[PDB]
Coordinates of C-alpha atoms in Angstrom, one line a residue:
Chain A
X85 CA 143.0 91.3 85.7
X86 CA 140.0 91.2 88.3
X87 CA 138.2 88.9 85.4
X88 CA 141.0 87.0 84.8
X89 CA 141.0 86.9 88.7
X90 CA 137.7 85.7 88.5
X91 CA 138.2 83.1 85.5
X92 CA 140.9 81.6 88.2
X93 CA 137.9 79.6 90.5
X94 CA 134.7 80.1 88.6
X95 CA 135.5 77.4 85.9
X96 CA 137.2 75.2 89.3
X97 CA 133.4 76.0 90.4
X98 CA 131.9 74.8 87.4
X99 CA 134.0 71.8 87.9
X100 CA 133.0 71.2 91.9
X101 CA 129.2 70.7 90.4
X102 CA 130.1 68.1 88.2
X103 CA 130.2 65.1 89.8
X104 CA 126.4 65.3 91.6
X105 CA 127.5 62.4 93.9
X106 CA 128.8 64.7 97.0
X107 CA 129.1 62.5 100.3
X108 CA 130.0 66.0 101.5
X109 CA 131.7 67.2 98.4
X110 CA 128.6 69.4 97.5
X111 CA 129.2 70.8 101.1
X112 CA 133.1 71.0 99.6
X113 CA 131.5 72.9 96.5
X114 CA 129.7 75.1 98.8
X115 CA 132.2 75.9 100.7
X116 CA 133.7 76.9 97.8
X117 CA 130.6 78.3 96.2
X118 CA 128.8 80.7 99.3
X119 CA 132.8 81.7 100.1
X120 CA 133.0 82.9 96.2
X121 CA 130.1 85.5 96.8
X122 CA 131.7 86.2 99.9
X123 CA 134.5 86.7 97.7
X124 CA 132.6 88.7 95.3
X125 CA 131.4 90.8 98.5
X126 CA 134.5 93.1 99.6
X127 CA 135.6 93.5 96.0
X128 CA 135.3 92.3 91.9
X129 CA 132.6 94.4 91.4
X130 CA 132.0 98.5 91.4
X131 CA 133.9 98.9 88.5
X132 CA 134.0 100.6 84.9
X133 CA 131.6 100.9 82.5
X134 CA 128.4 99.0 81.4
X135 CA 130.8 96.3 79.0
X136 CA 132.6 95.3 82.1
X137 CA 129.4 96.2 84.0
X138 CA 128.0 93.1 82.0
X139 CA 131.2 91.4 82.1
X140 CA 131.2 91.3 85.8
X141 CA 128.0 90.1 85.2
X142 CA 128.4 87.7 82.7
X143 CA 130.3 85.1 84.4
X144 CA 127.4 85.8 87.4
X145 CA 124.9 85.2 84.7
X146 CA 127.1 82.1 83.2
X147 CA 126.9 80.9 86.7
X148 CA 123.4 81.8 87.6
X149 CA 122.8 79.3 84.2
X150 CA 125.6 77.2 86.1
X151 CA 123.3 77.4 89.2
X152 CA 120.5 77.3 86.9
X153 CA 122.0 73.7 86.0
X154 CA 121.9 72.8 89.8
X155 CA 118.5 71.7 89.3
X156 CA 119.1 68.3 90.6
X157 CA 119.3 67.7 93.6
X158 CA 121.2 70.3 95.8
X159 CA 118.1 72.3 96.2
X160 CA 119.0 75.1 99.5
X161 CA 122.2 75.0 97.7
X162 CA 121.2 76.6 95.2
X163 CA 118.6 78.7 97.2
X164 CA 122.0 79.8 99.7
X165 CA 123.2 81.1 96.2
X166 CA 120.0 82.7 95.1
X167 CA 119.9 85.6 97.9
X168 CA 124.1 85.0 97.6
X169 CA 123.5 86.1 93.2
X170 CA 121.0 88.5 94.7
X171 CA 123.5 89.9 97.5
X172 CA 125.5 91.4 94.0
X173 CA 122.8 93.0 92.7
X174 CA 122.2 94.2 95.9
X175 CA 125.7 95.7 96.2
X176 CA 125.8 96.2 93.0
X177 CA 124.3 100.4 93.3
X178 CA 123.6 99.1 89.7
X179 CA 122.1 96.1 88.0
X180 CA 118.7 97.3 87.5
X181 CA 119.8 96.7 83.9
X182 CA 120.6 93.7 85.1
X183 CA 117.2 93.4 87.6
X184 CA 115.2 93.7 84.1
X185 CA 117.0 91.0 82.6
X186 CA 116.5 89.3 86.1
X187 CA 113.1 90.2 84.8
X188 CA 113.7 88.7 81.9
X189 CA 115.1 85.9 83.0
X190 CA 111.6 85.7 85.0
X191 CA 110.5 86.3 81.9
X192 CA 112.5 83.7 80.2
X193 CA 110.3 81.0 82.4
X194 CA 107.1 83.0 82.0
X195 CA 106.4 82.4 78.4
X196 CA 108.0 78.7 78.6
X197 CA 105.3 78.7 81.5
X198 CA 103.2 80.0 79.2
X199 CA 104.5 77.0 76.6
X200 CA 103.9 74.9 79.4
X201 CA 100.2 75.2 79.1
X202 CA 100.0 73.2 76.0
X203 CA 102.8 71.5 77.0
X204 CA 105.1 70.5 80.0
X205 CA 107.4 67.9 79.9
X206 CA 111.0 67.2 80.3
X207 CA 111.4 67.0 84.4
X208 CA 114.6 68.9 84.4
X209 CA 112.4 72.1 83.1
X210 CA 110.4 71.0 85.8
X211 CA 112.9 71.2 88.1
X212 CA 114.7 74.3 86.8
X213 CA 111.4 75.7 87.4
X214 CA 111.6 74.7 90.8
X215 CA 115.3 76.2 90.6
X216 CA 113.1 79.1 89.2
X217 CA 110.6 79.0 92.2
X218 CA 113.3 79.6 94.8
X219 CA 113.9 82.5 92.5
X220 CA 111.0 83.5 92.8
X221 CA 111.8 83.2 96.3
X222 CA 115.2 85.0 95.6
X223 CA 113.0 87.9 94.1
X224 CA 111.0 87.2 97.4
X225 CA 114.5 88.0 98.6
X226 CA 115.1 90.7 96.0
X227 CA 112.4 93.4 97.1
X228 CA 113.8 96.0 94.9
X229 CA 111.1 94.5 92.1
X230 CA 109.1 96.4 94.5
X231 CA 111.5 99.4 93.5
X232 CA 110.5 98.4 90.5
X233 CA 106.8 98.9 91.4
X234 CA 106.3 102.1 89.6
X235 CA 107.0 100.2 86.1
X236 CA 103.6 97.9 86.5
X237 CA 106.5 95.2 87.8
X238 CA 106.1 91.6 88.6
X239 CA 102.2 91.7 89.0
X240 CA 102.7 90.4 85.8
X241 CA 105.1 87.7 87.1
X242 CA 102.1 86.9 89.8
X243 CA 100.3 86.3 86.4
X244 CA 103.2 83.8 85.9
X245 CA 102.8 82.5 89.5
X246 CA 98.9 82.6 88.7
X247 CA 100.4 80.3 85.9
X248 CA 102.4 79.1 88.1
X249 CA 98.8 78.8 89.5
Chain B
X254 CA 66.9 107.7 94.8
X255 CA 69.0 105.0 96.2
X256 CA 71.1 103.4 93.4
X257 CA 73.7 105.5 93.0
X258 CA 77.0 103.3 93.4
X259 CA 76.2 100.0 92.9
X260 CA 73.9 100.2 89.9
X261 CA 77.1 102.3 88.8
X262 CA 79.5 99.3 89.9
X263 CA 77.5 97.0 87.2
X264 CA 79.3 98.6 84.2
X265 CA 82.8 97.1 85.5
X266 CA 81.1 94.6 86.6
X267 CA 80.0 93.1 83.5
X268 CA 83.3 94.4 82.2
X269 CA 85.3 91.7 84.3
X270 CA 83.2 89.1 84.5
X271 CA 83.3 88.8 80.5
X272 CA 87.3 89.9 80.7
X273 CA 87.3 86.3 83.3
X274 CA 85.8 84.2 80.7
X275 CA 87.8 83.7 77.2
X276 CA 90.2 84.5 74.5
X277 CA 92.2 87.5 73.4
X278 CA 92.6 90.5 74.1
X279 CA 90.9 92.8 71.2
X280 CA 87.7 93.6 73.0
X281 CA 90.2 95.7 75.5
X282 CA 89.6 97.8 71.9
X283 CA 86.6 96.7 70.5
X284 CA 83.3 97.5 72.9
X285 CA 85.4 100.1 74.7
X286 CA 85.9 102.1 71.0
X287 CA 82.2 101.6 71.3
X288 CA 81.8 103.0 74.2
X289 CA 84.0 105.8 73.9
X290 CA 80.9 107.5 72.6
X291 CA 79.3 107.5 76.2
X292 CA 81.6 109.5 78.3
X293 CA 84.4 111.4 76.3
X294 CA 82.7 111.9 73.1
X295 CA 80.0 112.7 75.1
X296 CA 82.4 115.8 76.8
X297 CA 83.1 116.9 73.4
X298 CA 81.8 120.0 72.7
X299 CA 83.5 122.2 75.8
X300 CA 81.1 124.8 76.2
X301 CA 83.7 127.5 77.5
X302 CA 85.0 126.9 80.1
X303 CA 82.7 123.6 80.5
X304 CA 82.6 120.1 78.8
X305 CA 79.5 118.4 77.6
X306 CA 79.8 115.8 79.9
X307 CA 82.3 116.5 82.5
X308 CA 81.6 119.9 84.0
X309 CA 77.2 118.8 84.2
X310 CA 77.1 116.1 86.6
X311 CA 79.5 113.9 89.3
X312 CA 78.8 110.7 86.8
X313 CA 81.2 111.5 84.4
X314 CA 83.9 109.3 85.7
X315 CA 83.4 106.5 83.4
X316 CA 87.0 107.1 82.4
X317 CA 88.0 105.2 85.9
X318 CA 85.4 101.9 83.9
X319 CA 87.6 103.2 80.8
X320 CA 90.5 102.6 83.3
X321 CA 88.5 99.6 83.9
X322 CA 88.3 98.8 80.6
X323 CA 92.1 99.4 80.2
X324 CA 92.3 97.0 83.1
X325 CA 89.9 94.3 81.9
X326 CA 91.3 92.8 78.9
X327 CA 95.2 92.8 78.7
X328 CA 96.9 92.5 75.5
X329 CA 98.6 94.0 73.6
X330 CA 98.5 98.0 72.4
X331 CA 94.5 98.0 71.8
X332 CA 93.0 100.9 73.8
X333 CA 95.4 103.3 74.4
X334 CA 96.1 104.4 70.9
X335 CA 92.5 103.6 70.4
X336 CA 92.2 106.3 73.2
X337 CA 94.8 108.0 71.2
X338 CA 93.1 110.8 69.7
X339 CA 90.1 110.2 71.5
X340 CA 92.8 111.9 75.0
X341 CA 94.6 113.8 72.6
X342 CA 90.7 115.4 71.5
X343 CA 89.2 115.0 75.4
X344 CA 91.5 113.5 78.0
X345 CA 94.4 116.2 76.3
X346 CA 92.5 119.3 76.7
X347 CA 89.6 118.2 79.4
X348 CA 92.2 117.7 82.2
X349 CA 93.3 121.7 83.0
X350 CA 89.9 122.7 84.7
X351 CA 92.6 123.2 87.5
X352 CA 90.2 121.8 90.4
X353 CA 88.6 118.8 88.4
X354 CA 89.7 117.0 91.8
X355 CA 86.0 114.8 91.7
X356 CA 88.7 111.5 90.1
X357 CA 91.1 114.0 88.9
X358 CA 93.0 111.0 89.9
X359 CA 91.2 108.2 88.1
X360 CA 91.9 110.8 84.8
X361 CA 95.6 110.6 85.8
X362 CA 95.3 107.1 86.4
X363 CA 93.5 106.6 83.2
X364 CA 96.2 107.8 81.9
X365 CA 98.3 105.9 84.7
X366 CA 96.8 102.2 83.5
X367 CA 97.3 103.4 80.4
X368 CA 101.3 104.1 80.6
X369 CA 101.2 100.8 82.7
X370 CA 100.0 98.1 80.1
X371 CA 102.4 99.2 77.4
X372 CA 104.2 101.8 74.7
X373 CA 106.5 104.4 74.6
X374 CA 105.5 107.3 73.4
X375 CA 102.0 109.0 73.2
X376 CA 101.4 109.5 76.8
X377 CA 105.0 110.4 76.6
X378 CA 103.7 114.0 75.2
X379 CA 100.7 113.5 77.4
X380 CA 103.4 114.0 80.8
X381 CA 104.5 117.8 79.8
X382 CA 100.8 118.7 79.9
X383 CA 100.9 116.8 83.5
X384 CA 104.0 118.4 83.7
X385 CA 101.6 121.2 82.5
X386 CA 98.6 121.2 84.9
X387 CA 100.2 120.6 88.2
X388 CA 99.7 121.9 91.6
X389 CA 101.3 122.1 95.1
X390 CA 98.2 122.2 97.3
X391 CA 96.2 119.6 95.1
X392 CA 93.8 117.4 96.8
X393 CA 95.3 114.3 99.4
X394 CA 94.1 112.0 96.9
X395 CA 95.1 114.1 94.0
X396 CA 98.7 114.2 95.3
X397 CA 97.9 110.7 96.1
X398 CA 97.6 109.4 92.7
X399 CA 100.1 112.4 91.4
X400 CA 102.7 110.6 93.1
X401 CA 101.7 107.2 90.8
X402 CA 101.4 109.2 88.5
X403 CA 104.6 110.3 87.4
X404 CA 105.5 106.6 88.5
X405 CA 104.0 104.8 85.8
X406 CA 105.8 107.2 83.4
X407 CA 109.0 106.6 85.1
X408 CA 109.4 103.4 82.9
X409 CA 109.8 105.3 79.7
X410 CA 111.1 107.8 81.5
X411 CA 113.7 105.8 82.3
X412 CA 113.4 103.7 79.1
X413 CA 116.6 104.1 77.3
X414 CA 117.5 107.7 76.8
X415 CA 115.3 108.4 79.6
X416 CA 112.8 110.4 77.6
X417 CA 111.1 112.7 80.1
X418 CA 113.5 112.7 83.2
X419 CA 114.8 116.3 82.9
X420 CA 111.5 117.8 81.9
X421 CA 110.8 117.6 85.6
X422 CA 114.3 118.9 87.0
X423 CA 112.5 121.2 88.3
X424 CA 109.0 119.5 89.0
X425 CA 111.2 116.9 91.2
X426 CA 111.0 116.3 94.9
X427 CA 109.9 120.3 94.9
X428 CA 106.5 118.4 94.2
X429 CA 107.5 115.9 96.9
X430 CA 108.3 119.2 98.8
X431 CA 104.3 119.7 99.1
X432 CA 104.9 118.6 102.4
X433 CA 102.3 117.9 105.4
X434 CA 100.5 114.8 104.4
X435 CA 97.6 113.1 105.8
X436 CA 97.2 109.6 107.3
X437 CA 99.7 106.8 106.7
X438 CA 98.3 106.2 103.6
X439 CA 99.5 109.4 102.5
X440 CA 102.4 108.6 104.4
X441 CA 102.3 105.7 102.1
X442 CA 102.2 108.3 99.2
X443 CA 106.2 109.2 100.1
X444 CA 106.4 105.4 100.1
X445 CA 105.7 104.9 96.9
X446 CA 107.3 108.2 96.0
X447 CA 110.3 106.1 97.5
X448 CA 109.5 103.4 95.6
X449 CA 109.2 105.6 92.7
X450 CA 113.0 107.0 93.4
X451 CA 114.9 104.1 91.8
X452 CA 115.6 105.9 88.5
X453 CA 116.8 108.9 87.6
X454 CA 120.9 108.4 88.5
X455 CA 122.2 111.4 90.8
X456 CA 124.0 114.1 88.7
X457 CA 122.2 117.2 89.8
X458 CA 120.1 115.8 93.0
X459 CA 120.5 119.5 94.8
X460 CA 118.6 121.1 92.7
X461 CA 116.0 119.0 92.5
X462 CA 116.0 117.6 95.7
X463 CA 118.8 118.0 97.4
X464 CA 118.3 115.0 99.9
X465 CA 115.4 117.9 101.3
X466 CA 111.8 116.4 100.6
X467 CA 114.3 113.3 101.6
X468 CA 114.7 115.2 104.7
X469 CA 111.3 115.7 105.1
X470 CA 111.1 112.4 104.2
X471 CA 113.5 111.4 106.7
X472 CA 111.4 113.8 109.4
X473 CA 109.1 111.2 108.5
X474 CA 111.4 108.4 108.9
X475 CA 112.5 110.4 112.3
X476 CA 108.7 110.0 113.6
X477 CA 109.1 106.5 112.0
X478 CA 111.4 104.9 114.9
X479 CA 107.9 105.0 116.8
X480 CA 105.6 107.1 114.9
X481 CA 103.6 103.5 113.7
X482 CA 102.3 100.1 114.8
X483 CA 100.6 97.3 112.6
X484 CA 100.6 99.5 109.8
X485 CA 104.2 99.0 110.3
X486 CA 104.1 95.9 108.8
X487 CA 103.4 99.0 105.8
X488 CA 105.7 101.6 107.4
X489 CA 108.6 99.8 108.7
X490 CA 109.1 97.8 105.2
X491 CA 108.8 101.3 104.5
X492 CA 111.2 102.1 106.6
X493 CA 113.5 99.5 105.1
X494 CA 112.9 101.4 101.5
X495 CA 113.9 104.3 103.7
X496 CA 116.9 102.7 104.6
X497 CA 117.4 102.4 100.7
X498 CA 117.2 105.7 100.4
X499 CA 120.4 106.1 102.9
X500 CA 121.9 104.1 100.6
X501 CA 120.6 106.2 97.5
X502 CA 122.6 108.7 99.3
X503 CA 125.4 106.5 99.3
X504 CA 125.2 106.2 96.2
X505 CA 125.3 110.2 95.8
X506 CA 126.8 112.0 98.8
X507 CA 129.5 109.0 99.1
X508 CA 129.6 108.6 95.5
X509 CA 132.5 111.9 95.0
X510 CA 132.7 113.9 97.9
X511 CA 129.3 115.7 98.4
X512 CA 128.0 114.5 101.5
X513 CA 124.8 116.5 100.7
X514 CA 123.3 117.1 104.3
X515 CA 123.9 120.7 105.9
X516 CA 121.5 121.2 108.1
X517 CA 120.6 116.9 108.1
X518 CA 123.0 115.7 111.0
X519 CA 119.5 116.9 113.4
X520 CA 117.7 114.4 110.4
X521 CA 120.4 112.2 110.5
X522 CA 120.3 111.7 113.9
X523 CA 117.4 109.7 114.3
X524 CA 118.0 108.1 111.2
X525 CA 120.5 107.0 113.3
X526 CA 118.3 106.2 115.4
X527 CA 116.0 104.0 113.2
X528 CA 120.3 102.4 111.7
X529 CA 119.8 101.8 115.3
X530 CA 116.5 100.2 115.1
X531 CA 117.5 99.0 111.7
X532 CA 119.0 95.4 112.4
X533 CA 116.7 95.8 115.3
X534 CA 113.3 95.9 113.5
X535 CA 112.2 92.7 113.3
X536 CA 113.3 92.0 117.2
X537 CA 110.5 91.4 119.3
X538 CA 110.3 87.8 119.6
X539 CA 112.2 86.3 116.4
X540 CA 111.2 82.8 117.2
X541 CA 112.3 80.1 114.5
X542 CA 108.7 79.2 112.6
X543 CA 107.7 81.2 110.0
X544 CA 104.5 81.0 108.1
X545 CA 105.5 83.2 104.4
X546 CA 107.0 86.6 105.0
X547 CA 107.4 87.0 108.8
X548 CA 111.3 87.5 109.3
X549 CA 113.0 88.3 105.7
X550 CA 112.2 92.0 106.4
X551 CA 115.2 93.2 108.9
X552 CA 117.4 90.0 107.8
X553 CA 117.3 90.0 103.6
X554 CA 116.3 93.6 103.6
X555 CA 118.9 94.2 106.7
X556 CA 121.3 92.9 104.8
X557 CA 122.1 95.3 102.1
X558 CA 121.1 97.5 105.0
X559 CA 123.1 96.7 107.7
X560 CA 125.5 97.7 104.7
X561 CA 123.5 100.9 104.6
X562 CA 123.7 101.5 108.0
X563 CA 127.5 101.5 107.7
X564 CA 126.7 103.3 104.4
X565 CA 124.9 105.2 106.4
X566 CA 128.2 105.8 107.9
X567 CA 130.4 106.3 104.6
X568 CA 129.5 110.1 103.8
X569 CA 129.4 110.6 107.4
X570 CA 131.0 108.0 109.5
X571 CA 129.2 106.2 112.8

């Protein structure tokens, strides 16, 4: 029931983002949102096998695109959740799975990067790459790329931040 | 008389210069396949025990420009199978002259480049002979690149079904158990070695390590509460992928009742120590203006372990 525990305030966070117009109500969706990862913290993870491994992580990766939506205009909000998706990962004594995808999900910007040689347009990809640049500064935050090192790692995502160059 | 390295350099040289300038990636293949001919085809005949061109002259590391050349033009599977049976022919059989230790290493790390950029599985038969010709009291730059070199195999050794993992069960942390290394690049070499220790999940750690090269790792990491200064901007991020390794033991010794440290609590204890000066690494000044890097080492990478340091304290409590 620990999913269903966690359907219970992740679609009440999905509804906190909605109206962008906060007057303090984004500070009342953080407080809900960097409390949820303190949530996640003590428990809701470290857990059965990889389907609920990914099922755990699911709903983090349907709010990562959730917090990949926060483009506009909470912007440290957003980078308070990127070390708090990364503290998971970091407790999760798994996730490397997970840290490729994370690569992936670099990689997911790299080649629309890559496509946005010849052409980049539509702001909000400009701005989700600026929510990807404070992932970058989340994988700043990450370091265990750098675990990663042996597997000619994010060198390659330097070639992305030399096209982010 | 006096052109020995830099009329050498010129070959990479005008390698990279025309890898900066255009298009795609074929020539990684095409004037390397060429040159092939110059070095390894070159070493061919093996005049018993000696190749043609290896075992004449000091020159014959144009495999390091062919590791150049596997580094100059990236994209996408050209060289390395076009090295294929050109290794498999030289690179296979011309690596067990069992000193070789003139860029043993940049033959390794041909190979090393080579498992880098991309594939699965032709260097993946080209590991047991490295799992092959091996040694204990190789070279400090032959263990040096040894330890990459295993590391750029770790990928697909660690690619699905893990490929290659147990075919050093044995030739684990036993290798890291070559012990007495030389200055803190070598002590950098366990640092990568570290860095390399993120695979391979923790079934049967005592025989292959047993948390012991760890230990001598951590006899490192005892020196390491003081043992470095300005290369600890190197050692003590080093130390904080030390303190990963505490919680690599958490994730074996407190994973079911192991607690894997006999005669450890004396290794351990400054460990303890450096849990100690773990929170506290990055307390000197700690002033509020930072210019990249400066302070994320012993506050993002403190915090997974500060919950290492009480994981640190979860097989064997504070």
């Amino acid at each position: 029931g620990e999913h269903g525990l966690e359907l219970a305030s992740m679609i009440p966070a999905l509804r906190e983002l909605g109206s962008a117009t906060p007057e303090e109500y984004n500070t009342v969706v953080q407080k809900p949102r960097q409390i949820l990862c303190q949530f996640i913290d003590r428990i809701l993870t470290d857990v059965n096998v990889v389907a609920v491994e990914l099922v755990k992580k699911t709903d983090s990766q349907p709010t990562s695109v959730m917090l990949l939506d926060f483009i506009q205009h909470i912007m440290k909000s957003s980078p308070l959740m990127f070390v708090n998706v990364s503290g998971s990962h970091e407790a999760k004594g798994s996730c490397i799975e997970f840290s490729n995808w994370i690569i992936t999900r670099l990689l997911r910007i790299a080649a629309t990067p890559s496509c946005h040689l010849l052409h980049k347009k539509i702001c909000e990809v400009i701005c989700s790459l600026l929510f990807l640049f404070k992932s970058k500064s989340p994988a700043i935050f990450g370091v265990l790329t750098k675990e990663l090192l042996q597997l000619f790692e994010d060198l390659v995502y330097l070639h992305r931040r030399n096209v982010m160059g | 008389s006096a052109p020995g390295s830099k009329r050498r350099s010129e070959p990479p040289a005008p390698r990279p210069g025309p890898p900066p300038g255009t298009g795609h990636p074929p020539s990684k293949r095409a004037r390397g396949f060429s040159a092939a001919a110059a070095p390894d085809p070159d070493d061919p005949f093996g005049a018993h025990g000696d190749f043609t061109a290896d075992d004449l002259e000091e020159l014959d590391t144009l495999a390091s420009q062919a590791l150049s050349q596997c580094p100059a033009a990236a994209r996408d599977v050209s060289s390395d199978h076009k090295v294929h049976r050109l290794l498999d022919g030289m690179s296979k059989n011309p690596s067990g002259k069992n000193r070789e230790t003139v860029p043993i290493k940049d033959n390794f790390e041909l190979e090393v480049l080579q498992a880098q950029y991309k594939e699965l599985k032709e260097k993946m038969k080209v590991m047991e002979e490295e799992v092959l010709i091996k040694n204990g009291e190789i070279k400090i730059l032959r263990d040096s690149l040894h330890q990459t070199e295993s590391v750029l195999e770790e990928q697909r050794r660690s690619h699905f079904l893990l490929e290659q993992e147990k075919t050093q069960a044995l030739s684990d942390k036993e290798k890291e158990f070559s012990k007495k290394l030389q200055s803190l690049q070598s002590e950098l070499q366990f640092k990568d070695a570290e860095m390399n220790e993120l695979r391979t999940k923790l079934q049967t750690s005592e025989r292959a390590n047993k948390l012991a090269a760890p230990s001598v790792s951590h006899v490192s990491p005892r020196k390491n509460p003081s043992v470095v200064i300005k290369p600890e901007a190197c050692s003590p991020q080093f130390g904080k992928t030390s303190f990963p390794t505490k919680e690599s033991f958490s994730a074996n010794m407190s994973l079911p009742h192991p607690c894997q440290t006999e005669s450890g609590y004396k290794p351990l204890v400054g460990r303890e120590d450096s849990k100690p000066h773990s929170l506290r690494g990055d307390s000197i000044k700690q002033e509020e203006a930072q210019k990249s890097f400066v302070d994320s080492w012993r506050q993002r990478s403190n915090t997974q372990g500060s919950i290492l340091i009480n994981l640190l304290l979860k097989q064997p409590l504070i």
